[PDB]
Amino acid sequence: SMTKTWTLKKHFVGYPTNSDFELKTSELPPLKNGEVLLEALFLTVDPYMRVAAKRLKEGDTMMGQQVAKVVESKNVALPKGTIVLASPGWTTHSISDGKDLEKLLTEWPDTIPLSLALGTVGMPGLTAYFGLLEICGVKGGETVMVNAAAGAVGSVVGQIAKLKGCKVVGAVGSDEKVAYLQKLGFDVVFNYKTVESLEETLKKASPDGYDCYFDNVGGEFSNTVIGQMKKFGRIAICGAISTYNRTGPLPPGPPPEIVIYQELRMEAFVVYRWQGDARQKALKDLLKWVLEGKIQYKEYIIEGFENMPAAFMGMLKGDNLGKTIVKA
Amino acid sequence: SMTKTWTLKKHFVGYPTNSDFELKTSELPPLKNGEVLLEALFLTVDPYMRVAAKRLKEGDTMMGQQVAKVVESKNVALPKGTIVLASPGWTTHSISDGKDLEKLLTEWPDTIPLSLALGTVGMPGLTAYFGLLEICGVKGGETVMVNAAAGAVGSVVGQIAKLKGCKVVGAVGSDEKVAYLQKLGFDVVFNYKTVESLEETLKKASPDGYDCYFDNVGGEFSNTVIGQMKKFGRIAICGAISTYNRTGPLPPGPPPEIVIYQELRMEAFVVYRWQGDARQKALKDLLKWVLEGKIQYKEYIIEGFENMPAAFMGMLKGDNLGKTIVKA
Ligand SMILES: CN(Cc1cnc2nc(N)nc(N)c2n1)c1ccc(C(=O)N[C@@H](CCC(=O)O)C(=O)O)cc1
Numbered sequence A, B: 001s002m003t004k005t006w007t008l009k010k011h012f013v014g015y016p017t018n019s020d021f022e023l024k025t026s027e028l029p030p031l032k033n034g035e036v037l038l039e040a041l042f043l044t045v046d047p048y049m050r051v052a053a054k055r056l057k058e059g060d061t062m063m064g065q066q067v068a069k070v071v072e073s074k075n076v077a078l079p080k081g082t083i084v085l086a087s088p089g090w091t092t093h094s095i096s097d098g099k100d101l102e103k104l105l106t107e108w109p110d111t112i113p114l115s116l117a118l119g120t121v122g123m124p125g126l127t128a129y130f131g132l133l134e135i136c137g138v139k140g141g142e143t144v145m146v147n148a149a150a151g152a153v154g155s156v157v158g159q160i161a162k163l164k165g166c167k168v169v170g171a172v173g174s175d176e177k178v179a180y181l182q183k184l185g186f187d188v189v190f191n192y193k194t195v196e197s198l199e200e201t202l203k204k205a206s207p208d209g210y211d212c213y214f215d216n217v218g219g220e221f222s223n224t225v226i227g228q229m230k231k232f233g234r235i236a237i238c239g240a241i242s243t244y245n246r247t248g249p250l251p252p253g254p255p256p257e258i259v260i261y262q263e264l265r266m267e268a269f270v271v272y273r274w275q276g277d278a279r280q281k282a283l284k285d286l287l288k289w290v291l292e293g294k295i296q297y298k299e300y301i302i303e304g305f306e307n308m309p310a311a312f313m314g315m316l317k318g319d320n321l322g323k324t325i326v327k328a
C-alpha cells in the first residue's frame, strides 16, 4: 500500500519551524510471512522528540508512537482488526514483524478514547506513576511541587498525588491551564509566566517547604524550587523542557550550598526502566483510576496527518490544552 | 588562664588573605563546677570553613575542631590528662561543660598520631566512609571518580574503594599529590591543573565511564564527569570546593539531557547524618584499616597556632601534601 511519512529535513535550531519537516510519499513492499501492515489511527507528539531528533540524520523519519490497527496480516497472533501500540515514527502506514508491538490492555473499554493509550493511560501516565511513587517515593501527606502541570505527565502526577493524600502545587504557562487544573483538585495553581515573583508565589503556596519535586522543566525554575525543599527532599528529574530549544548555554546550576545543607536526593529516570509485571500493574492502576473518576483527562485532537508538524510545534509552545494527539 | 583566638576581621573575597584574620588574646573565666579547661594540641583547617565563614559576623571566632587535653578539671568524668575532640573554634584554650565533647575511641593506640582523629580516623574519614559506601553504594567492581583526592576525604575514599575491590580514578592539584595517591593504590591519578583536556584524561582513565562519583569540587569539573557517568551512575555530593573561593557568577548546571538519558542518582550528604552505633562502627572500621595498612595516611603538620591562617590558605590552594593540621 501507500504511506505518508514526516522526515527531518533540517536539524532544529531553537524552536522547530515548518521548513524543518518534509512529507514524503512512498510505496511499501508486500507483506512477508510473519509480518503485518499497520494503519495509524492516532499518533502522538511529545517533548522528548525535540531532544531525540538531534540524534537523527537529516532525511530520517521523526520518531514517535501511535495507536494502529492491523489491516493486512501474515501473522496469526495479530489478525486483521487487532489494535496495537507501535513506534514506526511519524508515518500513516508501516510494516512490522510483530515483535516490536504491544497490544492494549485486554480490559480496555469503549467508554474512553483509544487515544488515551498514548496519554494518561499510556507512557505519559506511566511516567507520572513511577516518577512519583518510586523516584519521589511519596507515602502520604507530602507537599509535592510539579511544574508543566497541565501536560499529560504533570496533570497525572498531581492527581495520583491527591488520591494518595498529598498536597499539590502546580505551575503552568497560561491562565486557561490554571482553571483547568483547579477542576482537577490541585491545592494551588499559578501561571509562572505572569506571577510577579516565583519565589514569593512558591513560599506563599507552601511556607512549610516542599517534600517532593516532580521536575519536567529544569533551568532557573528548578533553582528556585530547590531553595524551598525540605531536608532530605526528593527530586524526580523527568524532563528539562525549558532547555530543549536553547540556543545559548545552560543557566546556572542550583546553589550547591543549599543542596548539601538540605542533603537533597535528585534522581533522573525514563519510563522504560520498568517493564514486565511492574509496567503492566501500573497500566491497570491508571485505567482503574480513570474509570473511577479519580484521574480525569483532556485531549487536544488535531485532524490530519499533514498537520503533525504543526501539532508538534504547538505542543512544545504549550499552546494546546490537554494531550496533543493527531488523528490520521 | 589566658587564650589566643583567631577571628574573622573581614569577609573573604575569593581566596582569603592574611589581612582577613585578626588574632586576639583574652582571659578565660574561672572553672565552674562540672567544667574543664581544654588546651589545644592539634587544630584542623578544612574546606568547609570557607563556606561557613560567610555566615559569621566580623569579629567572630573562626569555627573548627581540635584535639585537646584537659589541663584543669572540676568534672570527675573528664580528669586531668584526658584527650578529647572539641570544637571551640580556632583558639588555644577553652572551657567546656563536657556535653559538647567527644572522647577518642577506647581502643585508640599509641602507635598513631593523635592528629589522625581530625583526619583519616576523624570527620574527613567518616565523610569518605558514609559517602562512598552508603551514598554511592559501591558493591565491588565499580569504577569510582574522586576529586580533591589527596585530602583526607578523597584519600580515604580511594583506599576504601581499593579494599572493597573497585577501580579508582583520582584528580589532584599538584604533581607531588599525584605521586602520593599512586603509592596509596589509586589505579589512575592525574593533575587537573596541567592536563591538556579534562574530558580526554577522564576518558582514558575509564573509557567505559564511571559508576560512582564522589564529588568534593562541583562546577565545571563535575559537568565533565557527569558526561562520562554510566547509566544509573550515582553521585555523592559532598562538597563544591571549586565554588567556595569563586569570584564570578556560578557555572552552568549539568546538561540535563545527559542526566536524564543516563538516569543518574545524585544525593548530597553531611557526615552528621550518621550518629550513634553507625558512626562509632565506622570509626572503628577506619581505625582497623589504618592499623592493618589498608589505609595509609599523610599529615602536613604546621607548627605554631600563629600560623593557622597561613595553614588554612595553603590548604585551600592545594599547597600542602597530606591533611593540614596545626600543632599548637
Ligand atoms: C514514551 N515516553 C517515554 C520516553 C521518555 N523519554 C524518551 N527520551 C528519548 N530520547 N527517547 C524516547 N523514546 C523517550 N521515551 C514518553 C512520552 C511522552 C512523555 C511526555 O512528557 N509527554 C508530554 C506531552 C505533552 C502534550 O502533548 O501536551 C507530557 O508532558 O505529558 C514522556 C515520556
Ligand SMILES: CN(Cc1cnc2nc(N)nc(N)c2n1)c1ccc(C(=O)N[C@@H](CCC(=O)O)C(=O)O)cc1
Binding pocket: B045, B046, B047, B048, B051, B052, B123, B124, B127, B148, B150, B151, B152, B153, B154, B270, B271, B272, B315, B320, B322, B323, B324, B325
Ligand atoms: C567535620 N566535617 C564535617 C562537616 C562538613 N561540612 C560542614 N559544613 C559546615 N558548614 N559546618 C560544619 N561543621 C561542617 N562539618 C568535615 C571536616 C573536614 C572535611 C574535609 O573535606 N576536609 C578536607 C581537608 C583537606 C586538607 O586538610 O588537606 C579533606 O578533603 O580531607 C569534611 C567534613
